Structure 1
Amino acid sequence: SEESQAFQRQLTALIGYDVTDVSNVHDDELEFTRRGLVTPRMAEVASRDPKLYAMHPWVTSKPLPEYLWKKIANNCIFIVIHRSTTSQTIKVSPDDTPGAILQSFFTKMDFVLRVCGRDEYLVGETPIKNFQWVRHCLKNGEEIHVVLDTPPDPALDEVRKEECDRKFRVKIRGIDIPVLTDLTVFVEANIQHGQQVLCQRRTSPKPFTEEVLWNVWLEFSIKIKDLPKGALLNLQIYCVQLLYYVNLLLIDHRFLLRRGEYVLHMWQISFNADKLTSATNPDKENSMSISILLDNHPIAEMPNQLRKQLEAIIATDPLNPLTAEDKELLWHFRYESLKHPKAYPKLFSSVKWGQQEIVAKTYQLLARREVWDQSALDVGLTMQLLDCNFSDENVRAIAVQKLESLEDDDVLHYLLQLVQAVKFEPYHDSALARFLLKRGLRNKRIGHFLFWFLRSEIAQSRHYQQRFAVILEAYLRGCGTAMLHDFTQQVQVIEMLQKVTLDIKSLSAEKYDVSSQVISQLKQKLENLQNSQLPESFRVPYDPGLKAGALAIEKCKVMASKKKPLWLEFKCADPTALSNETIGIIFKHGDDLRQDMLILQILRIMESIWETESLDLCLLPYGCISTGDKIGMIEIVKDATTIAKIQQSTVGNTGAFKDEVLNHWLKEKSPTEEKFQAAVERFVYSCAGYCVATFVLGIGDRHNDNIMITETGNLFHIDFGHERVPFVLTPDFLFVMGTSGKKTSPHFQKFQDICVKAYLALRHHTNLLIILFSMMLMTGMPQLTSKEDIEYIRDALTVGKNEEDAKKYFLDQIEVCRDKGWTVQFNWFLHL
């Protein structure tokens, strides 16, 4: 049908890539995946409740933390209901449900309760203590305001109708680069499984000309019958240095042995998740290529010391290497290992995947999954089984099975790095992709962030754009017409605003200070865009509950920075919004904001870890979406400046520094002395939290220009673009603490206490943090050495040490900060 053709046009515009484009492929795996994803999409579409789906209540099953219980000593909670511009307060027990509040509301004086100024609803049979909006109002000491609205028409989510024993041999023909010190170049063929090179052959070294020819059969030691599914033929081009790489799945999505002629366009090197992609470089014009031929196809006692050695192995951290003896022990006593869910990553990383019968034994082992299936959900282990070291279908399938039991709250907590983990899938259609599709189609918020996460990569990396676009298209074909409309207008808005950001950046030279003519130009462009081209309103991508409307063109500016970010402020389209404050958005080009996304998501995961132990470090992981190559959006935190400007105002701008300035700023920006006390408390907590987080992630040695503070004392690092010091604990922070280099005021003692507590809390989830850090590096960083870079978070988390030594370690970090002072801060200016 032609309507379906226009609809595919629409989907392509939304995705930023055409999934029907068969130009850059050597098989039909992407199409097979588009076709296979139809079943789960339609299943979840038929299974989801229209009412709850449309109202998407953001709830949780976690208990209410201790610090938020300290805010409801009355066992009562006030809710301010607005029938129609007439507000009345109702007392509610934390256990009262939305329906209960209705049956009592009409007994104090069908419908639905919505959050004022937001597309959020308090619906469904959940104790209203478990509504995220209520927990937020409690955390920030705010009243819970609600509009009595009608249930959003469930019909608005309408969904359109869907419509043998032979050694493996590979002939290397040659390499061709259309245009390119010749030196020497050779080709290396690696049969790999999960980054584990099962075998390896090479060619002879030849001078590198724009065309090099071998026509040589490379025979590998592996028999064809031994090739495991998901095995990659990894072709690399060296010259000591690795110049090019590319990959081909030896077994396809049909269990068929790959066979025939292949001319693969390769990726150039500027370890790394990009080195695993099966996609070929779509730039057939400039990129190197290689020609290959495949002609080969149907798919009871245990001593004490040994059990102790085995448990020692099992107990070590995820980054602890496994000796050959360790692997042989794990494998010989594999049925004992199966009783310990934590031994699973190490047990399966001890499988000889290059042997067919060993893999069959491993599968028979996976059949004994009683202990694994009846074990509590350990996210660290699931992540470990989903990373780069596991290419087997069933191994990863068990991790996805464990993920299945997660609630939408935790799925949002881990969605970014699950999407990223999709990069470790050998095949486009995988249990992980299907699970992300399911959980996005089941919940509108998860689907919103899934759209934006998939699109951040689709429009930025050719390595995985095709796969992510297949998945995003599968999702869009089931999210519903309302969400398609929202996504369309969101994309249009962000594209206009990125146009403006780049066009303004062009108008300025290296000299930072922007001209007056450029202020005129920005005002002109914004007013021109506001009249007609800019839609009436749009959902804030990083906060899907907010609808932004008209531009406050008088408040829009551009920073006098090397990069020219745009500071835009919108009005809230929701007339029932309880305030008049503007929605702040920073549109920035020049930084890779995928790294910012990842660091922020790890920060949120750490906050949840701390909540599990009744701690609240008041971190502020502002919204942040990467929309394209070194371009994205950032949430504008209200009433926040930078420590740098707080120094510049009073101490001058010649690298000078004074210590009392922070406290004077907090007291002059504090209306009441009591609110200043509250601001100092918030400062201590947030500073401890950010010190701990920034040391754990190895990003603590920042410049005070990249550290901000709110007028209400809340501190927070920003711009994670990319003599040292473990973290930023400068003397101006200490003078707010109440210490003069040597003293130890009650607030500094509280700060040290909170630091040690949070640090040990993180050490409790050591494994999960290690795996998340490893995945973040592998999927979001430029280039990382597996040995050096990753193994920072082991020492940072002081692996293997008892809690006493870890406390002493973090306290000595604090003492290093105390000892150095402004050394690094001043050195930043010095090295101009």
Structure 2
Amino acid sequence: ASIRDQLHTIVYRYPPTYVLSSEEQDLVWKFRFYLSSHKKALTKFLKCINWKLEDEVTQALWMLANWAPMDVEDALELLSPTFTHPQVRKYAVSRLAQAPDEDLLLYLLQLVQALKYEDPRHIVHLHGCIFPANLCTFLIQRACTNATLANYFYWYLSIEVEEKQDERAHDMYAMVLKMFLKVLENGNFNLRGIFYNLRKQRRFIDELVKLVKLVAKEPGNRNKKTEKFQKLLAEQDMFKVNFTNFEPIPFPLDPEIYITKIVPMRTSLFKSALMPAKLTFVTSIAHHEYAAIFKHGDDLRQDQLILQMITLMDKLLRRENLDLKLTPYKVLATSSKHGFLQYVDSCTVAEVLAREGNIHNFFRKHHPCDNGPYGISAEVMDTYIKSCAGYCVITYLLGVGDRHLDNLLLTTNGKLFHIDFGYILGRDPKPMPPPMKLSKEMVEAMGGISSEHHHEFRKQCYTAYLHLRRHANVMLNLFSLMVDATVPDIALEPDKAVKKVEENLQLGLTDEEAVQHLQSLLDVSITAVMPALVEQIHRFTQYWR
């Protein structure tokens, strides 16, 4: 038949979390031998057979080895806690190895979570071998090959190692890190090198933290505190590291860039309540400054997960040839309670309005074109619309709550981005989120409800939503892996978190239905936002008396 081919298509090439496939799976089995169309199919096949029969397992194992090779994302699904079997786990690891380093890095965070699911005895044995294949051996081998990987891997392990089930995973992660440092210490010249560099980073942060704690103890309003901060950095050999000069250190935030000194005067502290510094650094090359922020008191693991998410979505959209000019900025955590964040030069939307009446005035000031469209250079408008679309959709998919003018920022080229992703998957302090988050001023920024640009924005949202809908599996698989993740919003209900993103993605609906649905959310949110729209609705209510 031909109908048969299509019912199968819905099943192998639609949803990954679905345990849905039920008996149809048995039907899948028959075609399975004749045609394993694709990799997507392999992931689906694996789900149905395993537990019941040893002989059935033998046939499946042979089937998997023969099978057309799976794509990496599916590999993540395999590393998931759902699949117990060692051979499938090994196969999943083989898939990862084949993948290029940069892609391997993007996932890395999940791979560390994945570590929890890999059997403990592999890890105890490996330890046994080092003191008086399996994935953890794989992560260490790969981590050693590449310095940047070594660096993130080290930072992720260390975040886990500091102070019920916490005990089992902590001992195990601790085991992993000790092994990693010991492999580097022995390794050769390049590995020894990696080890020294980390030693340096660790030392630098500790002193940086010490200085920060002194600043907090010292009393004053922010400015008095900041002046004090400037003074400490300039103070030579109060600290183990001298902040005005040091030996070059690959930035922990970015491993690629060494730093030299810090400039005491260029350091500010932020308006936000928990006060984080901007710092500047010089860099090893040509003296170029870098800045990052550094944050005194918060666990950023949540922020890093969301940013990875935004980075990933952006990568996917870009291959599709959609650039929404999203800015994913680097975060890392250090310890829980400190990290860095990349600094983007921007003005907070609230600052822009306070300081320039409206967004347009501010853009116009930076990029005047007499000729169009708002007396603002066309490209800036374009980037602003695109950033807006990218963010509504991503904020919506990732269920990001708690946005405000302090929260959004702008750039001088136009882009908008978000910040401070403390509320995730629809947690909001408030009782009633709008489903889509657009400030009145942002809508006005587009020249109101009826403008060419507003239409461009909605068109753009639908397209972006549709593309993400298509590339579901990867995000769902990364979330599947973040169940026991120690990200607070996920921690409230582990299970519901994966389900929530799936619900937002709206995979059930047909494409025409999904666009209509999205349109509906945008519309309620925008009507609520505009006052003219609200008075007009009152008028319609009134019309029936």
**Normalised TM-score (structure 2):** 0.81
Deviation at 1:522, TM superposition (A): 1.5
SS in 2 for 1:587: strand
1:127-146 superposed matches below 5 A: none
Deviation at 1:475, TM superposition (A): 5.3
Structure 1, unmatched stretches of 5+, are 1-302, 651-659, 824-832
Counterparts in 2 of 1:368 and 1:459: CA distance versus 1, 3 Å? same
Give the partner amino acid of 1:704. L
Whether the 8 Å CA contact 2:303–2:422 is kept in 1: the answer is yes
1:629-640 superposed matches below 5 A: 629-637=336-344, 639-640=345-346
Whether the 8 Å CA contact 2:409–2:418 is kept in 1: the answer is yes
1:227-246 superposed matches below 5 A: none
For 1:473 and 1:735, locate their aligned partners in 2 and report how far apart those are by CA, in whole Å.
55
Counterparts in 2 of 1:756 and 1:311: CA distance versus 1, 3 Å? closer
2:389 alignment counterpart = 688
Give the partner amino acid of 1:544. P
Q: 1:318 aligns with which of 16, 25, 37?
A: 16
Query: Is residue 2:85 matched to residue 1:388?
Result: no
Q: Deviation string for 1:679-733 (max 9, x for gaps)?
A: 3222112111111211111115522222221222121111112321233222211
Whether the 8 Å CA contact 1:662–1:736 is kept in 2: the answer is yes
Query: Is residue 2:207 matched to residue 1:501?
Result: no
For 1:505 and 1:641, locate their aligned partners in 2 and report how far apart those are by CA, in whole Å.
26
1:735 alignment counterpart = 444
Deviation at 1:675, TM superposition (A): 7.8
2:292 alignment counterpart = 585
Give the partner amino acid of 1:523. Q
1:26-45 superposed matches below 5 A: none
Whether the 8 Å CA contact 1:701–1:726 is kept in 2: the answer is no
Deviation at 1:586, TM superposition (A): 1.5
Q: 2:119 aligns with which of 426, 433, 451?
A: 426
Counterparts in 2 of 1:456 and 1:806: CA distance versus 1, 3 Å? same
Give the partner amino acid of 1:546. I
Deviation at 1:407, TM superposition (A): 1.7
Query: Is residue 2:253 matched to residue 1:545?
Result: no
1:672-683 superposed matches below 5 A: 676-683=377-384
Whether the 8 Å CA contact 1:327–1:347 is kept in 2: the answer is yes
Give the partner amino acid of 1:709. L
For 2:176 and 2:262, locate their aligned partners in 1 and report how far apart those are by CA, in whole Å.
33
SS in 2 for 1:813: helix
Whether the 8 Å CA contact 1:490–1:538 is kept in 2: the answer is yes
Q: 2:156 aligns with which of 439, 446, 453?
A: 453
SS in 2 for 1:567: strand
Q: 1:571 aligns with which of 282, 295, 315?
A: 282
Q: Deviation string for 1:1-55 (max 9, x for gaps)?
A: xxxxxxxxxxxxxxxxxxxxxxxxxxxxxxxxxxxxxxxxxxxxxxxxxxxxxxx
Counterparts in 2 of 1:386 and 1:337: CA distance versus 1, 3 Å? farther
Give the partner amino acid of 2:48. S
1:698 alignment counterpart = 399
Q: Please provide the CA RMSD for this pair.
A: 3.2
Whether the 8 Å CA contact 2:326–2:387 is kept in 1: the answer is yes
Deviation at 1:676, TM superposition (A): 4.3
Give the partner amino acid of 2:358. V
Whether the 8 Å CA contact 1:706–1:717 is kept in 2: the answer is yes
1:519 alignment counterpart = 226
Is the deviation greater in 705-714 or in 409-418? Answer: 409-418
Instruction: Give the total of aligned pairs.
Output: 495
Query: Is residue 2:418 matched to residue 1:717?
Result: yes
Deviation at 1:483, TM superposition (A): 2.6
Whether the 8 Å CA contact 2:159–2:334 is kept in 1: the answer is yes
Counterparts in 2 of 1:459 and 1:680: CA distance versus 1, 3 Å? farther
Deviation at 1:469, TM superposition (A): 0.9
SS in 2 for 1:800: coil
| Structure exhibiting the larger radius of gyration computed from Cα positions | 1
1:529-540 superposed matches below 5 A: 533-534=241-242, 535-540=246-251
SS in 1 for 2:414: coil
SS in 2 for 1:633: strand
SS in 1 for 2:257: strand
For 1:474 and 1:313, locate their aligned partners in 2 and report how far apart those are by CA, in whole Å.
47
For 1:404 and 1:412, locate their aligned partners in 2 and report how far apart those are by CA, in whole Å.
12
Give the partner amino acid of 2:413. T
For 2:394 and 2:496, locate their aligned partners in 1 and report how far apart those are by CA, in whole Å.
20
Give the partner amino acid of 1:551. I
Whether the 8 Å CA contact 1:623–1:635 is kept in 2: the answer is yes
Deviation at 1:819, TM superposition (A): 1.2
Whether the 8 Å CA contact 1:351–1:359 is kept in 2: the answer is no
Deviation at 1:346, TM superposition (A): 4.4
SS in 1 for 2:325: coil
For 1:734 and 1:399, locate their aligned partners in 2 and report how far apart those are by CA, in whole Å.
46
Deviation at 1:470, TM superposition (A): 4.0
Counterparts in 2 of 1:416 and 1:802: CA distance versus 1, 3 Å? same
2:328 alignment counterpart = 621
1:749 alignment counterpart = 455
Larger proportion of strand: 1
Q: Deviation string for 1:118-170 (max 9, x for gaps)?
A: xxxxxxxxxxxxxxxxxxxxxxxxxxxxxxxxxxxxxxxxxxxxxxxxxxxxx
Deviation at 1:417, TM superposition (A): 2.1
Deviation at 1:319, TM superposition (A): 2.3
Deviation at 1:385, TM superposition (A): 0.8
Deviation at 1:818, TM superposition (A): 1.0
Whether the 8 Å CA contact 1:340–1:371 is kept in 2: the answer is no
Counterparts in 2 of 1:666 and 1:519: CA distance versus 1, 3 Å? same
Deviation at 1:781, TM superposition (A): 2.1
Deviation at 1:344, TM superposition (A): 4.0
For 1:508 and 1:361, locate their aligned partners in 2 and report how far apart those are by CA, in whole Å.
71
Structure 2, unmatched stretches of 5+, are 127-132, 424-431, 532-545
Deviation at 1:562, TM superposition (A): 3.6
For 1:313 and 1:508, locate their aligned partners in 2 and report how far apart those are by CA, in whole Å.
63
2:408 alignment counterpart = 707
Q: Deviation string for 1:55-91 (max 9, x for gaps)?
A: xxxxxxxxxxxxxxxxxxxxxxxxxxxxxxxxxxxxx
Q: Deviation string for 1:347-368 (max 9, x for gaps)?
A: 4443453x5xx24531442122
Give the partner amino acid of 1:684. I
